[PDB]
C-alpha cells in the first residue's frame, strides 16, 4: 500500500534522518557567527588605528581619514548585530524547535500504531461475527465500511505528518529569513556609506597636486 | 619664520611620525583580512549542511534548501576575492609605499640640509663683501632668493605628504569598491531567495498535487 508506504516514509524521516542533519545546520550556522564577531571585532581595531592617523595629520585629508573610520566602525558595529540576530532569530529558536518536533513525531507514531491496531480489531471481531441473504447482506455492507473507514484514516494519517513536515520546513526558512533580510540591510548601509568615501577620497586624490590655500596664504603673508 | 617652521614639521612628520601610524593600518588590515577569509570559510561548510538536507528532503522545499545553499556559496566565494584585493592592492602595495617614502624623506632631508647651510655660506659672504666696498642690492635680492629656496622647500615637503596620502586612499579604494560589489550580489541573491521562502511558507498548508492523486488512486 503507496498511502501507508509514504506515511512510513515520512514518519522515519522527521524521526531519524532530519534531527542530526538539522543540527549540523545550527552547528554551522553557530561556527558562522562566532567568525563573523570576530570580523567585526577585527574591523573596530582597523578603524581605530585610521582614527589614529588624525593624531598628527589634520587637513582635509584627515578629515577623510576620520570619515573612512567612522564608516568602517558603523558598519563593524552593524555586522555585530546581524550576527546576533542569526544566533537569536535562528540558532536558539530552531534548536528548540528540532527537540519539539522530535518529540511531537513519537506522538504521532504512537498514535499511528494505536489506530491502525484498533482498526485491525473491530474488522477481525466484524469479521468473527461470521445466513439468510438478509443476514449475510448486513454483515457484508458493515465489514465494508469498516474497511471504508481504515483506509479513511490511512489518508488523513498521510496528510498529518506530510503537513508535519512541511511545516517544520517552512519555519526553518521562516526563522532563517531573519538573518537574511538583516544580510540584505548591512549590505544596503554599506553601498550607502563607501560610495560617500570613494567620492570623498576621488576629490582628495584629484588635489594631491594643489597647496592648500590657507598655506598659500602664509606664504604671500610672509615679508 | 612660519614657512621654516611648518617645514621641519612636515619633515619630521614624515619622517618620525608617519611610518609607524601606517604600519599599524597595515597590521590591522591583515588581520581583517584573515578574519574575512575564516568566516568565508565557515560560510562553505553552512552551505554544505544545507545541500545535504536535499539527500532525504526534495519537492519545493528540498529545491529551497539546495537554491539557499548555491547563494550562500556564491558569496562567501566573493567573499574571499574580497579578502583578496585588500591584500594584493592594500597591504602588500602600500607596506612597499611606507618603504619607499622612507628613503624619499631621507634623500629628501640630506639635500634640505646641504642647499640651506650653503645658501648661508653664500649670504654671509656676500654681505661681508660690500662691507669692504662702500668703504648690496644683490644682497636684498639674495636674501629673497633665500625666502624662495625656502618657500620651494615648503611646497615640495607637502606636497609629499599630499601624494603619500593620496596614494594610500587610492589602493585602499581598491577594497571599498570590491566591498561595494559584494554587497550588491548579496542584496541581489539573497532577495531571490526571500522570494522563493515566501512562495514556500505560504504553501505550508496545502498538501502537493502528487499526494491527493495517489490518495484517490488507493481508493480505485
Redesign the interface.
Known amino acids: ?3 501507508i508506504e ?1 506515511t512510513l516514509k515520512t514518519i522515519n ?1 522527521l524521526k531519524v ?2 534531527p542530526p ?2 543540527t ?2 545550527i ?3 553557530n ?2 557567527q ?3 564577531q ?2 567585526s571585532q ?2 573596530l ?2 578603524a ?3 582614527t ?2 588624525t ?3 589634520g587637513g582635509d ?1 584627515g578629515e ?1 581619514f576620520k570619515k ?1 573610520a567612522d564608516a568602517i566602525k558603523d558598519l563593524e558595529n552593524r555586522r555585530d548585530d546581524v550576527a546576533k540576530v542569526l544566533l537569536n532569530e535562528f540558532i536558539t529558536p530552531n534548536k528548540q524547535a528540532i527537540e519539539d518536533d522530535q518529540k511531537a513525531i513519537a506522538t504521532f507514531e504512537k498514535n499511528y500504531k494505536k489506530d491502525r491496531d484498533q482498526m485491525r480489531q473491530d474488522i477481525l471481531k466484524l469479521e468473527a461475527k461470521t445466513t439468510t441473504p438478509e443476514v449475510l447482506k448486513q454483515q457484508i455492507t458493515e465489514l465494508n465500511d469498516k474497511i471504508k473507514e481504515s ?1 479513511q484514516l ?2 488523513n494519517k ?2 498529518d505528518v ?2 508535519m513536515e ?2 517544520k ?2 519555519t526553518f ?2 526563522q ?2 531573519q538573518f ?2 538583516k ?2 540591510e ?3 548601509d ?2 550607502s556609506k ?2 560617500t ?2 567620492n570623498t ?1 576621488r576629490d ?2 584629484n ?3 594643489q ?1 592648500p590655500l590657507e ?1 598659500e596664504s ?2 604671500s603673508k ?1 615679508e
Open positions: 500500500n503507496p498511502v509514504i524521516n534522518n532530519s542533519l538539522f549540523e545546520v552547528k554551522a550556522a561556527k558562522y562566532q567568525q563573523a570576530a570580523l577585527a574591523g581595531v582597523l581605530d588605528t585610521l589614529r592617523l593624531i598628527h595629520n585629508f577623510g573612512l483506509e490511512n489518508a498521510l496528510r506530510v503537513l512541511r511545516r520546513h517552512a526558512l521562516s532563517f529569513n537574511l533580510e544580510e540584505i548591512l549590505s544596503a554599506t553601498m563607501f560610495s568615501n570613494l577620497h582628495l586624490i588635489s594631491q597636486s597647496l598655506m602664509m606664504i610672509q
